[PDB]
């Protein structure tokens, strides 16, 4: 009972994480210099992994 419901709670938190990863990726792209392009790739993979497992 707590199992499937806690799965639903986790998917709530991961929808929040998906929106925050979208926002962080365009945050890094809006920078005048964005040196951590590897971190941009990491945030992009994080975003797509979040959407996919949701």
């Amino acid at each position: 009972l707590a199992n499937e419901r806690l799965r639903a709670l986790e998917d709530i938190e991961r929808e929040i994480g998906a929106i925050l990863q979208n926002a962080g990726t365009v945050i890094l792209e809006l920078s005048k210099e964005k040196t951590n392009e590897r971190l941009l790739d990491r945030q992009a993979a994080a975003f797509t992994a979040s959407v996919q497992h949701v």
Partner: protein, 157 residues
């Protein structure tokens, strides 16, 4: 030949502007007569469909396979101060007496002074870093943006 292309461009762009006009009118009359029960999804949907469809369609019919619209210049032939019912029937329920005021009202390319002050501020911001950091930022942005679209187009498979 090119005049037929200009006539096609004028008809197609008048079509797109007519769709945007009907979309704006439907949205404003919906806001008036439908004021109650109006959720934020409803107005986001209307804003998105209106601006997305009609701005993108105007841009794509403005920037492919078209004659240069700087080349055509607008000039009037006559100015006759009389109530022309054929003009009233042409321009749709608008455009009173064809006189000394309407063409000096319409051929106006000075914008509002707010966006003119905005343009002054853009030229002020243009006085900053240019031609090395500018080219560097353009190239890096295009590279990383192509990289992300490549990532998403790969993962979509």
């Amino acid at each position: 030949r090119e005049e037929k292309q200009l006539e096609a461009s004028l008809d197609a762009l008048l079509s797109q502007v007519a769709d945007l006009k009907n979309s704006l009118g439907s949205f404003i009359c919906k806001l008036e007569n439908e004021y109650g029960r109006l959720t934020w999804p409803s107005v986001l949907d209307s804003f998105a469909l209106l601006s997305g469809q009609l701005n993108t369609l105007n841009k794509v019919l403005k920037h492919e396979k078209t004659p240069l619209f700087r080349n055509q210049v607008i000039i009037p032939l006559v100015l006759s101060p009389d109530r022309d019912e054929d003009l009233m029937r042409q321009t749709e329920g608008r455009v009173p007496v064809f006189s000394h005021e309407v063409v000096p009202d319409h051929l106006r390319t000075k914008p509002d002074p707010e966006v003119e002050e905005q343009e002054k501020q853009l030229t002020t911001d243009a006085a900053r870093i240019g031609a090395d950091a500018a080219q560097k930022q353009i190239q890096s942005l295009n590279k990383m943006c192509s990289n992300l679209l490549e990532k998403i187009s790969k993962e979509e498979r």
